[PDB]
From Swiss-Prot, chain D:
Semipurified toxin complex consists of at least YenA1-YenA2-YenB-YenC1-YenC2-Chi1-Chi2. The Yen-TC:K9 subcomplex is about 26 nm tall and 22 nm in diameter with 5-fold symmetry and 5 copies of YenA1, YenA2, Chi1 and Chi2; the chitinase subunits may be solvent accessible on the exterior the complex. The Yen-TC:K9 subcomplex has no insecticidal activity. The native complex with additional YenB, YenC1 and YenC2 subunits is 16 nm taller and is insecticidal; the toxicity-conferring subunits are present at about 1 copy each. It comes from the Bacteria. The chain holds residues 50 to 147 of 1364 of the full protein. This is Toxin subunit YenA2. Part of an orally active toxin complex (TC) with strong insecticidal effects on larvae of the Coleoptera Costelytra zealandica, Acrossidius tasmania and Adoryphorus couloni and some Lepidoptera larvae. The TC has an endochitinase activity. Disruption phenotype: Cells with a disrupted yenA1-yenA2-chi2-yenB-yenC1-yenC2 locus are no longer pathogenic in C.zealandica larvae. It is found in: Secreted. The isolated toxin complex includes 3 peptides starting between residues 768 and 778 of this protein, which might be physiologically relevant. The gene is yenA2.
Swiss-Prot record, chain E:
The lineage of its organism: Bacteria, Pseudomonadati, Pseudomonadota, Gammaproteobacteria, Enterobacterales. The chain holds residues 927 to 1023 of 1364 of the full protein. Part of an orally active toxin complex (TC) with strong insecticidal effects on larvae of the Coleoptera Costelytra zealandica, Acrossidius tasmania and Adoryphorus couloni and some Lepidoptera larvae. The TC has an endochitinase activity. Semipurified toxin complex consists of at least YenA1-YenA2-YenB-YenC1-YenC2-Chi1-Chi2. The Yen-TC:K9 subcomplex is about 26 nm tall and 22 nm in diameter with 5-fold symmetry and 5 copies of YenA1, YenA2, Chi1 and Chi2; the chitinase subunits may be solvent accessible on the exterior the complex. The Yen-TC:K9 subcomplex has no insecticidal activity. The native complex with additional YenB, YenC1 and YenC2 subunits is 16 nm taller and is insecticidal; the toxicity-conferring subunits are present at about 1 copy each. It is found in: Secreted. This is Toxin subunit YenA2.
From Swiss-Prot, chain F:
The gene is yenA1. It is found in: Secreted. Disruption phenotype: Cells with a disrupted yenA1-yenA2-chi2-yenB-yenC1-yenC2 locus are no longer pathogenic in C.zealandica larvae. It comes from Yersinia entomophaga. This is Toxin subunit YenA1. Semipurified toxin complex consists of at least YenA1, YenA2, YenB, YenC1, YenC2, Chi1 and Chi2. The Yen-TC:K9 subcomplex is about 26 nm tall and 22 nm in diameter with 5-fold symmetry and 5 copies of YenA1, YenA2, Chi1 and Chi2; the chitinase subunits may be solvent accessible on the exterior the complex. The Yen-TC:K9 subcomplex has no insecticidal activity. The native complex with additional YenB, YenC1 and YenC2 subunits is 16 nm taller and is insecticidal; the toxicity-conferring subunits are present at about 1 copy each. Part of an orally active toxin complex (TC) with strong insecticidal effects on larvae of the Coleoptera Costelytra zealandica, Acrossidius tasmania and Adoryphorus couloni and some Lepidoptera larvae. The TC has an endochitinase activity.
From Swiss-Prot, chain G:
Disruption phenotype: Cells with a disrupted yenA1-yenA2-chi2-yenB-yenC1-yenC2 locus are no longer pathogenic in C.zealandica larvae. Part of an orally active toxin complex (TC) with strong insecticidal effects on larvae of the Coleoptera Costelytra zealandica, Acrossidius tasmania and Adoryphorus couloni and some Lepidoptera larvae. The TC has an endochitinase activity. This is Toxin subunit YenA2. It comes from Yersinia entomophaga. It is found in: Secreted. The isolated toxin complex includes 3 peptides starting between residues 768 and 778 of this protein, which might be physiologically relevant. Semipurified toxin complex consists of at least YenA1-YenA2-YenB-YenC1-YenC2-Chi1-Chi2. The Yen-TC:K9 subcomplex is about 26 nm tall and 22 nm in diameter with 5-fold symmetry and 5 copies of YenA1, YenA2, Chi1 and Chi2; the chitinase subunits may be solvent accessible on the exterior the complex. The Yen-TC:K9 subcomplex has no insecticidal activity. The native complex with additional YenB, YenC1 and YenC2 subunits is 16 nm taller and is insecticidal; the toxicity-conferring subunits are present at about 1 copy each.
Length: 146, 209, 39, 98, 97, 63, 48, 49
């Protein structure tokens, strides 16, 4: 009730009509790839051709992501049940790219359901310029949620 | 101390799961999936055309599971990987149509919206595509939903905007019904009478939806 | 790998593909004097 | 197929009303599948040739039937590995015979 | 004199269909395209890392003395890869300006 | 065997192959029994080609 | 051509032989690829 | 280095041969090769890749 008219009615109608709330301007977590569609569409006046170059420029990248291989996973020291369970993965075609992600084993329904669709995260790339390793053995660890 | 079979696994790479009565709250069985073969199904079809990727018959392609003791009779939208199907089968089709709608490219925006929905065709080639969707041509607009349960306790429009496909597909209809009118007015403004009045051939289709 | 003795030798690189694309592995036109390789 | 109860001040050719009736009908049968007819995928492709109408229709023939209208240097060029190497020297705002 | 004055407004009006329409031409399109073409700044640097790695993972020389692995090469290359982002984004800003 | 078609295809069904310029494939396929359809699914690969074979024989004359 | 001449043959011969600069061509390709942008984004100043 | 191709199906039957359009035009190769087995570089087709 800080500011009032029209602002109050929107408290319901911005939930009660989902078509008002749906737009491409989502809360996007997919920043590692969704920017690679837009930077080709980043043009002031354009034509029907430009989209095909933009689409294929994303679709080349997409298949490498779908071929990522999981190498290791960090269990919560010695604990089990409701773990975040971090995993590390890489590209097979060359050992150049490394990534990590996680899952929410607590997020479920009890009525013979399992982990809920949102209960899994998305890959983040690793920035540090590694060049030598003990034969692909790179180890992730958790330091009180660092 | 204690140990568990959270371990390496046979040829389909999915890792071992340590307990049948579950490592967690409910008895999900000693089974999981991780990776997918989808690129080996896609590379051919996608190098042939985009128009084959935005075919419901392509979207229903097979995988395999026999190493864990099941069968993967189609590409399944499983939460550990499922977003990459949606990103490819909806969002790339959408943003082009969104740009083109604005930039006076109305019939080009229509040529992209025709990968989602087709209120103009009743005579497609596959008998199963004639039968099942029937008007909708990206399958995650129709394929298996459930509940929306485990986001209810903090519930918001950020949850409800993707609880189910029906209101999401009725939003595609709201974008489409605008796109006819957005072009019709460009025939009515600044032209001469027998061209201005031609806009009624658009308003008479919009008023049929 | 060239599964036969003494590399550095000119042996070309070749293929005569006929079945299974994911097994389209390469071939060589010589080893030492006449004999083939288990590859 | 007739505009009843409206347009009290408007004037137009009889040919426009005759056209409008068939023009609406050939839209209407593709707009909805009542009555029980259907349209083959070629015919259902080719309403592309009546989506917008006057002058646009006549160009369907005359843009083939006069090749001199269609001939311009703005070709479908595949020769991109070399034809750009003519233009990047001609890429000047005001120039001379040299 | 009233019939003469009409042209002062009419000539000031009836030209401007040459400006409220045909507001763009093919040359001032290429003025955008040669800016936005910097979308390859995802690719412009990448042969750096692999070259630096190939100059590191194995030696340059073998014999009585063996070695020549250029210790700093990858971390020295990372700064160039990181720098390249700015020239592209601050010229995408010229494209969108 | 081919004259068994030309007796009745040309007897009533179509005046000439040039009038097959009317059709779309599903329209044409619907009308025909096994004695046509079992020896007819190839036709539109050359008969629609016939339906644009007369095309310049009265315009190549431009001199 | 400079990168290739620094690669295809050794720098030194003797008890130790070699000095072929392994990364030289791929290290050079990125500079060749970069140069296109400075020209096209100044052809845009010419045509502006 | 460059590659190209031809359409051996595109012809007329009446004692004609490959039609004038039935041949493609050279595309250059981008990858920075510097060493080879004495000019032996091999192209291959991987289900139309």
């Amino acid at each position: 009730f800080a500011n009032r008219y029209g602002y109050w009615a929107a408290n319901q109608q911005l939930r009660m009509f989902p078509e008002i709330y749906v737009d491409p301007t989502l809360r996007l977590t997919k920043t590692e790839f969704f920017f690679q569609l837009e930077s080709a569409l980043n043009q002031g006046k354009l034509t029907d051709d430009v989209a095909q170059k933009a689409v294929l420029g994303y679709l080349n990248n997409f298949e490498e992501v779908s071929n990522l291989e999981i190498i290791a996973g960090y269990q919560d020291g010695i604990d089990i049940e409701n773990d975040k369970t971090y995993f590390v993965a890489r590209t097979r075609m060359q050992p150049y790219r490394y990534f990590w992600r996680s899952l929410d084993a607590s997020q479920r329904n009890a009525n013979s359901q399992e982990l809920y669709p949102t209960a899994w995260s998305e890959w983040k790339a690793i920035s540090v310029p590694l060049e030598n390793v003990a034969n692909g053995i790179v180890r992730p660890i958790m330091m009180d949620n660092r | 101390r204690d140990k568990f079979q959270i371990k390496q696994f046979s040829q389909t790479q999915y890792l071992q799961f340590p307990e049948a009565s579950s490592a967690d709250v409910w008895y999900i069985g000693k089974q999981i999936r991780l990776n997918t073969l989808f690129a080996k199904e896609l590379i051919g079809k996608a190098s042939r055309s985009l128009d084959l990727v935005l075919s419901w018959e392509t979207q229903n392609s097979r995988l395999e599971e026999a190493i864990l003791g099941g069968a993967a009779e189609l590409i399944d939208l499983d939460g550990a990987n499922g977003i990459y199907f949606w990103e490819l089968f909806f969002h790339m089709p959408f943003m082009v149509s969104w740009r083109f709608n604005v930039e006076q490219r109305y019939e080009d925006a229509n040529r992209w919206v025709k990968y989602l929905f087709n209120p103009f065709e009743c005579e497609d080639e596959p008998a199963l595509l004639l039968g099942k969707p029937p008007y909708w041509n990206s399958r995650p607009l129709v394929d298996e939903p459930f509940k929306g349960y485990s986001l209810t306790q903090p519930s918001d429009p950020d949850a409800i905007a993707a609880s189910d496909p029906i209101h999401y597909r009725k939003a595609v209809f709201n974008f489409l019904t605008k796109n006819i009118i957005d072009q019709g007015d460009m025939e009515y403004r600044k032209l001469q009478p027998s061209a201005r009045t031609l806009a009624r051939l658009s308003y008479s289709t919009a008023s049929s939806l | 790998e060239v599964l036969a003795d003494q590399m550095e030798e000119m042996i070309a690189v070749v293929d005569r593909m006929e079945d299974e694309p994911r097994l389209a592995l390469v071939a060589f036109k010589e080893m030492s004097e006449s004999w083939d390789v288990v590859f | 197929l007739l505009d009843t109860q409206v347009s009290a001040k408007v004037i137009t050719s009889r040919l426009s009303l005759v056209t409008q009736s068939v023009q609406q009908y050939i839209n209407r049968i593709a707009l909805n599948l009542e009555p029980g007819l259907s349209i083959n995928q070629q015919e259902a492709t080719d309403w592309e040739e009546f989506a917008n109408r006057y002058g646009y229709w006549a160009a369907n023939q005359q843009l083939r039937m006069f090749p001199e209208i269609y001939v311009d240097p703005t070709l479908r060029l595949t020769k991109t590995e070399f034809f750009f190497q003519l233009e990047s020297a001609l890429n000047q705002g005001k120039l001379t015979d040299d | 004199a009233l019939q003469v004055s009409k042209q002062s407004a009419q000539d000031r009006y009836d030209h401007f269909k040459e400006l409220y329409d045909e507001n763009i031409s093919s040359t001032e399109q290429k003025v955008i395209e040669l800016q936005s073409q910097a979308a390859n700044s995802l690719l412009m640097a990448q042969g750096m890392r692999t070259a630096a790695a190939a100059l590191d993972v194995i030696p340059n020389i073998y014999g009585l003395a063996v070695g020549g692995s250029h210790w700093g090469a990858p971390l020295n290359a990372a700064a160039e890869i990181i720098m390249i982002k700015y020239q592209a984004d601050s010229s995408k800003s010229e494209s969108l300006s | 065997y081919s004259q068994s078609l030309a007796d009745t295809l040309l007897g009533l069904g179509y005046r000439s192959i040039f009038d097959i310029a009317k059709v779309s494939r599903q329209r044409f396929i619907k009308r025909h029994d096994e004695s046509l359809l079992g020896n007819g699914a190839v036709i539109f690969d050359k008969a629609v080609s016939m339906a644009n074979q007369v095309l310049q024989k009265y315009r190549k004359n431009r001199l």
